[PDB]
DNA sequence: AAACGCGGGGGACAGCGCGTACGTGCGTTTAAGCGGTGCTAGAGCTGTCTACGACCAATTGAGCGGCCTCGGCACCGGGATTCTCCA
DNA sequence: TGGAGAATCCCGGTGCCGAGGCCGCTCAATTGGTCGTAGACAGCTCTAGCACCGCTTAAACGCACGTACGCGCTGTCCCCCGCGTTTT
């Protein structure tokens, strides 16, 4: 078959040619009465305050994963490791 | 009558009604429920209690009684929660904590 | 099926091989017991004999075996229950509650000795039953 | 940082609340309920 | 020209917590532009809680609402505490 | 008489959710390392929110989740995001 | 005591019969039980084999 | 109940200005979620600056610092003119 | 979809080379900064002052919620196109 | 440097629900009078920033140089993804 790595682009493409989340919505509804059940119960669940966090999550997480690439190609590595992602948070500020 | 200050009655220094003043001067509601200024002086001393400690352990810990802002910079700075808090405030002559780069160490 | 212990005998091992150093693993392994639990309060209740105001308007007006008792006539237990007081309700509550509690604990006693007894056996290289 | 508010309102002991519960590591035990099977085996090999 | 500072106030508290050490007026100053600093913050944070409910009596509850929000970790409960704590001497004073 | 509690879809947020967000944003050779390095600091995101969200709902004396308290939080945390009135 | 660690340690002699199962299996204070334990194994009749 | 909607004023703007352009109304519901929003950032600032200039009057010239100060450029000075010069229409009408 | 695999070949990685760079030392000043002037400037303090939108009475149409479309753009069928991987 | 094929872009037919306007009906936004007062703005003063040089002198700078590390170059192995899978 084919060796390890050529179709990522088109995807780093695609993805970004298009407008959409990349995740599961079954568990995204069921992970947000997930994490706001934790806090206090009883909750009658809008999907307004459901949907309304993923934009903030996954954008800024493919964010992340160009500030990893860039610690990583500026370490000179494509397979990314989680040193580059910390290295990043850090300099980030998350870590 | 007399300015008794309202910080006596709550067992403060810091004079409550001179913060139900600052509330009702901060436009911060039509009424300013009148314990909204003790809870405001209240965590004021809980804070300058909380700080005053520090200071005085890490003024007392380079051996002068007199805190200083260096002291302030080496005692906040070592917390987590109040350097995480306070990431972004700076103390003017209060430096650097003593650190180097681990690498950079020579060998 | 008569125990809980982590059956993988390369697990045990590696659990052990590690916790002397001071070391987590990857996964699971709990103590060995039997299996079965002893699952009250999901079970037999207390049972209400009283209505949801029989309390209160008593107050204003001044007041073989099934499980664990023998199924009474029809017309022998009626004029019983024509004779008692809202102040032995609550008496006979717990008193029918305590004997379904001791049927309960007394036929999962039973079970939990004839799985003991396999068990002790098996711990001890004999087969089953012998 | 409780203990550390214990001092600002007495200048002007134990949790009872937290009542922690019993797990134990397992011993290496073979027969005893409670404990992990490892080494010497029941059977003689 | 007698002008309402803090820096007697937090002397008190120094002497109250430090008396071991006095202070430098640097770090006095420090305190207290940090006492008018976070007097804002936290009241600021509860007219924004004010005209998010709309309202226009804070009391100490919209006080610890605040400082339930922005305080992490003991910090908050500990100002839940503290911050309830004189007013639990005020509302009895 | 049913408990609906969830807990840890950040699995059923799949691994190829990785694979197709990693691209998204800009990784080729996503290394076994990071796809779970991945999914523990989000839900430090996760929880912070609601930890202050939550804390919007009972002082206004409610038992329901609005969107309006999650735009409370993020543009409390400087996360302004539009669409939703303002 | 003695007949619950001699019944326990036959079962299996292959097995060192520790002190500190002894110790979660009956109640007792641990100074005894380790005593009794040490007494009991240097007359033999519990890990000798 | 009237409640002060943004559809209709920015979509005047977008027929005077991309009036071959529709809008989406979630694309709408981003201009009705800009709308009070920017009109309170630089109105928290403005009131900063009243008192800073420890006023109890906030004229024009007020937003033109909170102009001035803040934004990037000739979007500062656009509208260093354009809120002037509307303000200079409306001192005119 | 997920999910489970699965060649598979080159990407990480080690590692060795190489050569230079960047401190290091020390010679060389040198502008740093200090004092020390001389002064004056706008800050600062007062000194009145009025105008200014406050505020509230009246009004009124604004503008937007509820009520009428029909059409920009999505969806899809089919084909042209166009990038990529092995000749 | 080239065709086979797989992905993409583009183009034709459908239809629809959302974008936009329509129809009241206020209600808010305005105009209309204050209203002292806020800051408008005059005076006053005094200060506090002002350069400036005397001068030092150690800091900066002037340069010899020495080697360290950062990259020059390699092989690898590994490792992660691609193709195929299905189920979930």
Same mark, same amino acid.
């Given at each position: /078959?084919?060796?390890?790595?050529?179709?990522?682009?088109?995807?780093?493409?695609?993805?970004?040619?298009?407008?959409?989340?990349?995740?599961?919505?079954?568990?995204?509804?069921?992970?947000? /009465?997930?994490?706001? $059940?934790?806090?206090?119960?009883?909750?009658?669940? $809008?999907?307004?305050?459901?949907?309304?966090? $993923?934009?903030?999550? =996954?954008?800024?997480?493919?964010?992340?994963? =160009?500030?990893?690439?860039?610690?990583?190609?500026?370490?000179?590595?494509?397979?990314?490791?989680?040193?580059?992602? $910390?290295?990043?948070?850090?300099?980030?500020? =998350?870590? | 009558?007399?300015?008794?200050?309202?910080?006596?009655?709550?067992?403060?220094?810091?004079?409550?009604?001179?913060?139900?003043?600052?509330?009702?001067?901060?436009?911060?509601?039509?009424?300013?429920?009148?314990?909204?200024?003790?809870?405001?002086?209240?965590?004021?001393?809980?804070?300058?209690?909380?700080?005053?400690?520090?200071?005085?352990?890490?003024?007392?810990?380079?051996?002068?009684?007199?805190?200083?802002?260096?002291?302030?910079?080496?005692?906040?700075?070592?917390?987590?929660?109040?350097?995480?808090?306070?990431?972004?405030?700076?103390?003017?002559?209060?430096?650097?904590?003593?650190?180097?780069?681990?690498?950079?160490?020579?060998? | 099926?008569?125990?809980?212990?982590?059956?993988?005998?390369?697990?045990?091992?590696?659990?052990?091989?590690?916790?002397?150093?001071?070391?987590?693993?990857?996964?699971?392994?709990?103590?060995?017991?039997?299996?079965?639990?002893?699952?009250?309060?999901?079970?037999?209740?207390?049972?209400?004999?009283?209505?949801?105001?029989?309390?209160?308007?008593?107050?204003?007006?001044?007041?073989?075996?099934?499980?664990?008792?023998?199924?009474?006539?029809?017309?022998?237990?009626?004029?019983?229950?024509?004779?008692?007081?809202?102040?032995?309700?609550?008496?006979?509550?717990?008193?029918?509650?305590?004997?379904?509690?001791?049927?309960?604990?007394?036929?999962?006693?039973?079970?939990?000795?004839?799985?003991?007894?396999?068990?002790?056996?098996?711990?001890?290289?004999?087969?089953?039953?012998? | 940082?409780?203990?550390?508010?214990?001092?600002?309102?007495?200048?002007?002991?134990?949790?009872?609340?937290?009542?922690?519960?019993?797990?134990?590591?397992?011993?290496?035990?073979?027969?005893?309920?409670?404990?992990?099977?490892?080494?010497?085996?029941?059977?003689?090999? | 020209?007698?002008?309402?500072?803090?820096?007697?106030?937090?002397?008190?508290?120094?002497?109250?917590?430090?008396?071991?050490?006095?202070?430098?007026?640097?770090?006095?100053?420090?305190?207290?532009?940090?006492?008018?600093?976070?007097?804002?913050?936290?009241?600021?944070?509860?007219?924004?809680?004010?005209?998010?409910?709309?309202?226009?009596?804070?009391?100490?509850?919209?006080?610890?609402?605040?400082?339930?929000?922005?305080?992490?970790?003991?910090?908050?409960?500990?100002?839940?505490?503290?911050?309830?704590? !004189?007013?639990?001497?005020?509302?009895? !004073? | 008489?049913?408990?609906?509690?969830?807990?840890?879809?950040?699995?059923?947020?799949?691994?190829?959710?990785?694979?197709?967000?990693?691209?998204?944003?800009?990784?080729?050779?996503?290394?076994?390392?990071?796809?779970?390095?991945?999914?523990?600091?989000?839900?430090?995101?996760?929880?912070?929110?609601?930890?202050?969200?939550?804390?919007?709902?009972?002082?206004?004396?409610?038992?329901?989740?609005?969107?309006?308290?999650?735009?409370?939080?993020?543009?409390?945390?400087?996360?302004?995001?539009?669409?939703?009135?303002? | 005591?003695?007949?619950?660690?001699?019944?326990?340690?036959?079962?299996?002699?292959?097995?060192?019969?520790?002190?500190?199962?002894?110790?979660?299996?009956?109640?007792?204070?641990?100074?005894?039980?380790?005593?009794?334990?040490?007494?009991?194994?240097?007359?033999?009749?519990?890990?000798?084999?």
């Amino acid at each position: /078959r084919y060796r390890p790595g050529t179709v990522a682009l088109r995807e780093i493409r695609r993805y970004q040619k298009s407008t959409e989340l990349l995740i599961r919505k079954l568990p995204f509804q069921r992970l947000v /009465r997930e994490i706001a $059940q934790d806090f206090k119960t009883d909750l009658r669940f $809008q999907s307004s305050a459901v949907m309304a966090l $993923q934009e903030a999550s =996954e954008a800024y997480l493919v964010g992340l994963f =160009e500030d990893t690439n860039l610690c990583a190609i500026h370490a000179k590595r494509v397979t990314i490791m989680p040193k580059d992602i $910390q290295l990043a948070r850090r300099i980030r500020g =998350e870590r | 009558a007399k300015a008794k200050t309202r910080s006596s009655r709550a067992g403060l220094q810091f004079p409550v009604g001179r913060v139900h003043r600052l509330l009702r001067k901060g436009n911060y509601a039509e009424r300013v429920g009148a314990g909204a200024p003790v809870y405001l002086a209240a965590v004021l001393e809980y804070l300058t209690a909380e700080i005053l400690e520090l200071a005085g352990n890490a003024a007392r810990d380079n051996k002068k009684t007199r805190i200083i802002p260096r002291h302030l910079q080496l005692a906040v700075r070592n917390d987590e929660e109040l350097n995480k808090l306070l990431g972004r405030v700076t103390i003017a002559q209060g430096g650097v904590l003593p650190n180097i780069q681990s690498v950079l160490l020579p060998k | 099926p008569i125990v809980t212990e982590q059956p993988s005998a390369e697990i045990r091992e590696a659990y052990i091989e590690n916790f002397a150093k001071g070391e987590h693993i990857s996964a699971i392994v709990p103590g060995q017991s039997i299996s079965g639990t002893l699952e009250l309060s999901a079970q037999f209740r207390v049972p209400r004999y009283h209505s949801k105001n029989s309390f209160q308007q008593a107050l204003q007006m001044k007041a073989q075996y099934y499980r664990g008792l023998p199924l009474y006539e029809k017309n022998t237990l009626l004029e019983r229950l024509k004779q008692l007081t809202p102040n032995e309700i609550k008496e006979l509550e717990h008193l029918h509650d305590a004997v379904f509690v001791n049927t309960g604990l007394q036929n999962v006693r039973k079970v939990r000795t004839k799985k003991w007894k396999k068990y002790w056996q098996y711990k001890a290289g004999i087969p089953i039953g012998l | 940082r409780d203990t550390r508010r214990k001092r600002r309102q007495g200048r002007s002991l134990p949790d009872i609340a937290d009542i922690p519960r019993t797990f134990r590591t397992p011993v290496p035990s073979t027969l005893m309920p409670g404990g992990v099977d490892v080494g010497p085996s029941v059977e003689s090999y | 020209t007698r002008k309402e500072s803090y820096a007697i106030y937090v002397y008190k508290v120094l002497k109250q917590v430090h008396p071991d050490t006095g202070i430098s007026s640097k770090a006095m100053s420090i305190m207290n532009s940090f006492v008018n600093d976070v007097f804002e913050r936290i009241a600021g944070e509860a007219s924004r809680l004010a005209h998010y409910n709309k309202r226009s009596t804070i009391t100490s509850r919209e006080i610890q609402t605040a400082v339930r929000l922005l305080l992490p970790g003991e910090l908050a409960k500990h100002a839940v505490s503290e911050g309830t704590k !004189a007013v639990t001497k005020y509302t009895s !004073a | 008489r049913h408990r609906k509690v969830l807990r840890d879809n950040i699995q059923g947020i799949t691994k190829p959710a990785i694979r197709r967000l990693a691209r998204r944003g800009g990784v080729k050779r996503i290394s076994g390392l990071i796809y779970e390095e991945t999914r523990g600091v989000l839900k430090v995101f996760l929880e912070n929110v609601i930890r202050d969200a939550v804390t919007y709902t009972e002082h206004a004396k409610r038992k329901t989740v609005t969107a309006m308290d999650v735009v409370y939080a993020l543009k409390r945390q400087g996360r302004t995001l539009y669409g939703f009135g303002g | 005591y003695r007949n619950f660690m001699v019944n326990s340690y036959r079962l299996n002699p292959n097995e060192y019969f520790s002190v500190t199962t002894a110790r979660r299996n009956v109640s007792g204070d641990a100074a005894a039980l380790f005593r009794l334990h040490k007494f009991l194994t240097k007359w033999g009749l519990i890990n000798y084999q």
